[PDB]
Amino acid sequence: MMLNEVTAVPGTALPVAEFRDHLDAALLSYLRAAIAAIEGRTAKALISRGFRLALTAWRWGDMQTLPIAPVATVTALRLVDAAGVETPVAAGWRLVPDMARPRIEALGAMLPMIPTGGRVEIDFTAGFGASWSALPVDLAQAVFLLAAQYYELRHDGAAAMPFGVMALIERWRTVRVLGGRP
Amino acid sequence: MMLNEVTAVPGTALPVAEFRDHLDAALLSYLRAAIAAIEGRTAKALISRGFRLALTAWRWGDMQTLPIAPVATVTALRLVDAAGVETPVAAGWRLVPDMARPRIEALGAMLPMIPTGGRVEIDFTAGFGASWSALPVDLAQAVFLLAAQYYELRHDGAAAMPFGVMALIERWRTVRVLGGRP
Amino acid sequence: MMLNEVTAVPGTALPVAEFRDHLDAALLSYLRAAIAAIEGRTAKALISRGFRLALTAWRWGDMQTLPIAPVATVTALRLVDAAGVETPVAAGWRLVPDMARPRIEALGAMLPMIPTGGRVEIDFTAGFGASWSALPVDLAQAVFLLAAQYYELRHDGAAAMPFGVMALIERWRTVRVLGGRP
Amino acid sequence: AVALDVHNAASAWSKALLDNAARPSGAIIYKGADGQGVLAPEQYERLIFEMETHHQGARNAGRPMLLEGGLDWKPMGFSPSDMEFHETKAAAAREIAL
Amino acid sequence: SVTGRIVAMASGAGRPVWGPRDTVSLMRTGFAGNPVGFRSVKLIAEATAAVPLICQVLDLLRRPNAGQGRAELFEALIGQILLSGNGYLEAVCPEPGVPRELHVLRSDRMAVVPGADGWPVGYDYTVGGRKHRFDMTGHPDPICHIKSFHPTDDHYGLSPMQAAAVALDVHNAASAWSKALLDNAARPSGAIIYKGADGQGVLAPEQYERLIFEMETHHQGARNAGRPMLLEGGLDWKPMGFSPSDMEFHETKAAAAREIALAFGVPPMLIGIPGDATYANYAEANRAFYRLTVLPLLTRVSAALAWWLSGYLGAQIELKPDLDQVPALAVERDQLWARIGAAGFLSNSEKRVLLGLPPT
Amino acid sequence: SVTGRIVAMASGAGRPVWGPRDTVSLMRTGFAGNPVGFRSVKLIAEATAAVPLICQVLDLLRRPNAGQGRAELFEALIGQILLSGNGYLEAVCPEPGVPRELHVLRSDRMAVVPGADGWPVGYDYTVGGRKHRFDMTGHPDPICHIKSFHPTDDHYGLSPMQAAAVALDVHNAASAWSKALLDNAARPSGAIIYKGADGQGVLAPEQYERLIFEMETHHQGARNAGRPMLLEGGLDWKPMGFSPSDMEFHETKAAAAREIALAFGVPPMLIGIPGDATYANYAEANRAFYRLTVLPLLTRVSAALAWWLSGYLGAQIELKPDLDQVPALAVERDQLWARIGAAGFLSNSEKRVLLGLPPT
């Protein structure tokens, strides 16, 4: 399980003008430093980039839920060999689009069996929307409440409002109560 | 279970003039950043948009209560196939309009059986009213008490009035005491 | 159980002049934002509007107490069918006017049986009086103590007097000690 | 006549104690970032699933139940379990036969 | 019989009224699932098949079919009357009289058709998707249907397992509770809490390999029980426990095991349930076993066999258990001989007849 | 038999219907895995092989094949009927009549082919990748298939181990719980907490070698139990405990051991399970053992042998246990002699016939 993204957000999609109105190379540097901070706490994507979940062994035979939460249209499910055969399989799975458990389950059988050493790599487009105007506005406000904080204080100094950065992203985090076997 | 809305609120319905009188592109940016924050804590809609609850398996055979609370006039209950047959069924259910458990129960039998892989998608119009003047005024005041706070402080700084933002929306949240099987 | 009111208070009944003397489109906006806040905590009505308790199944066979507390003169008890037969029944019940349990019990038998899917809708006139001068003056003072607070501070900032907003409405709330089956 | 009432009422005490009594095996306390806050339906369906599948049943007795920040599991008990009016019903049964 | 006209049609005239159902689900989790339900049926079935039967049918009963014998026939027969309350005995009869073979058709693959009035018109052996439709419109009536007493059912019997259906679940689930409690349960013997200089901080891999080594080599194992474990600044060892260790659903599983044996009628001494000694020394426990739940069950199956087989041979044969040649009633056999043997007022000719002996 | 036409094809006509499976996994963790399941089968198998058989076959039974003898043949045979519920006995027959050798083919390497109607058409001994396909279309039918009673299966039997499959896991896992609890468990007798002048600070190697020496020499061992251990400023000794010490899954493993013996039918007194005394003094425990789970099992295997071997010799031989020459029924043997010996109303000629003695 690697999950290294393919292409980053270009920056023409991030709201540098709207952030500036909320309060440019530094402004862009705090917007993404607050997007990465929030999407690392909530396991979201928020700009619908392209990822590559290149793992080596399925956790189940009808599973391997994807780490990044808002997912749509898995592009390919490649099965390399020990030498890198890079053969794309096209059938045997289906993405169950959920905000809770974005998973790629099966087609009535097991996942495409993984060659010994031949890791499987899945590339998908996970995120809310391609443009900033497609995000949930409470998650967009949390990015602003955080980026505007990174901008106003440069080193780790100290100052809990009713709906702060935490209270806004507390409903986008993943709720898990399993630290066990399955 | 996806629940991605179809069309957002245009903004001509949000009370930018009344909010300005309470204290315009920034004002509109804090009104919806406070509507989304409050309707995410109370699981309400407040402007009666159109949604799409596209799930894959019913939780019961006479159930699948809808996530957004104030619901009216489910438009369609489509049953796609594995290829996307998009066949709309017209009978077999009924919406029980409740503020507590907005559910689409049955017609004396099971729900329309879901094709294997052929997710069911339900599109409904959930909300209080089409215009801002139809909201419960205490929920409308909570949006103002929150939006006027997002406007007066830009980053997460600190300052509990008798009926604050929390005490006003505490009676619109969903009260659940089941974390179990049914 | 929906309980969506029919017609709101016009505003010519709310005491905008008396509130102004206590301290006009904003004043009217805080009066109703404090009436809705107090009547949501006490489950009262205070202006005797018209409601529609459109439920689907009686909780008992000699019951279905009404949610809004001060009730008088239930207008109709309609029994629609699965298609909306909208047939008004006229006998079989009686309203027991109480401030504690405003209930519509029976006439020596069960309630009018509800058609399968054919929800029953009850429309009543619940409230203290048609004019503001008919309210209990302690409940009217609580609306002023709250509306005058919404007016003097616009966002959720902080500051318990002997008879405050809470101590005045603490005797109008519903006291319930059943979270059980009956 | 009194021993019959004590026997009838203590027997209906045990029966009613089984018909209407909420014994939970625990509770998943979710305060949240605020002092109080519910979890979205997207987090409920996820949580209601991981509890039903992995943490409920006889075949799931001991799963270590990773608890994130904010979440908490308070194991609840049932303090008086046996012998509710046990001897007072037995002594009443002996006084009827007496 | 007169009411048979109105109850048969009200139940479905000439249509298969199948078994109560679940008659196959409970057989897997009540017989092949737990030892108490397995040993209870096995104890009753092999004891009932071991009792000799007298003929006031034999050659046939001793060698029923080319497969199972007299012992296996009754076991496989009683094994159905206990598991489902229904016992079917098919008989094939190439020549008139005593039928050649007797077969015990499993009761969950058999349904009754009430017919027109009262008594059924046939039976349907339904395996896979195919039926056979036996016929009851004859004098032999090839199917003998032994039913346990069912108060509310009209065409089938009641299984003692159906009564203990909840006790079997409590026993199965409490046994799987203890097993799962061992398969997935993280019991640590302690914890090395390392807060660090900060409020929280991990220790480098150079400090992990050192710490993982000094714990494995010097502080783990039986040969390392008591090492004083110097704890530096920041480090700490919190000894963790395991509060409920024994007896997880111990008595509720034991009480459930006693209620399964209670339903089937075996005394818990015989199968081996650890509990109070209601019987003394297995002399009365076995005698009460053969008297309360073995012979009363056999005297019904044997009586149904006799009346059914006597419909083939031209006689009204009787077939009852031989209460003399049973080792379980020896405690009762001798106390009879002691009473009549010590009775001197009557002569030897009188007491030979009293004890069942032919005079001399 | 008539339904045999529709059930055989619905189960697969002429195709190997293999065993329920796991018949080899449970044999390793239920017989060679734990002592209770090992001793239970070993106790039943050697007791069943030790009972003499009467012939109302002998020379063959006493010397079955060039390898195992009469004792080992029945042990290896009953050892399969207990472990898997299936017992196969191959017979090779160069000359007509009593076959030369009897071999007990292991039941997990054998599958049944139902054939056309009812009874099987052959058997497949599948070792490695090769089969043999015995043939059942003959009068001798070289394979004798002893099945324990299975209510839902049509071609195989039920193993008493399959019922106790969960109790064997609870016993195996609770025994490995205690073992692993000893192999990886850090029990320190204390801890020398050294916070230091700061909130946290290690002690130099010059202070470690000094401290590690004064603890090893003066404060460790049995000869150093009570040294008052002067603790300077900053140092501290926190005596650590071990809260759950004994009885980790103690009763749940004992109750599991009792349920394994319950399923196999042995009284826990015989194998040695510590528990309540249901039987008194092994006089009734052994008598109930040979009466409830040894002779009922032998009277089936011996009956199947007789009917199968009588298909070779031109006779319908009977072969039943010799209930006289068994030391386990002496408690029952004498109480019979006491009842009929003390009976004076009948003459010596009558009681010699009652006790099984040829008159004189």
Author numbering:
A (entry chain B), B (entry chain B), C (entry chain B): 1 to 23, 36 to 171, 175 to 197
D (entry chain A): 198 to 295
E (entry chain A), F (entry chain A): 24 to 79, 90 to 393
Article passage:
Gene transfer agents (GTAs) are DNA-containing phage-like particles produced by some species of bacteria and archaea. The genes encoding proteins that form Rhodobacter capsulatus GTA particles (RcGTA) are derived from phage DNA, which has been integrated into the bacterial genome. Here, we use cryo-electron microscopy (cryo-EM) to determine the structures of RcGTA before and after DNA ejection, and to visualize the interactions of RcGTA with R. capsulatus cells. Particles of RcGTA have heads with a diameter of 38-nm and 49-nm long tails.
The RcGTA head contains a special vertex in which a dodecamer of portal protein subunits (Rcc01684, g3) replaces a pentamer of major capsid proteins. The structure of the portal complex with imposed twelvefold symmetry was determined to a resolution of 3.3 Å. The portal complex is cone-shaped and contains a central channel with a diameter of 28 Å at its narrowest point. According to the convention established for the portal proteins of phages, the portal of RcGTA can be divided into the clip, stem, wing, and crown domains. A dodecamer of adaptor proteins (Rcc01688, g6) is attached to the surface of the portal complex exposed on the outside of the head and the adjacent part of the RcGTA capsid. The structure of the adaptor complex with imposed twelvefold symmetry was determined to a resolution of 3.3 Å. The maximum outer diameter of the adaptor complex is 143 Å and the minimum inner diameter is 35 Å. The adaptor protein can be divided into four domains: the attachment domain composed of β-strands 1–5, the tube domain formed by α-helices 1–4, the adaptor loop, and the C-terminal hook. Residues 175–197 from the C-terminal hook of the adaptor protein interact with helix α8 from the clip domain of the portal complex.
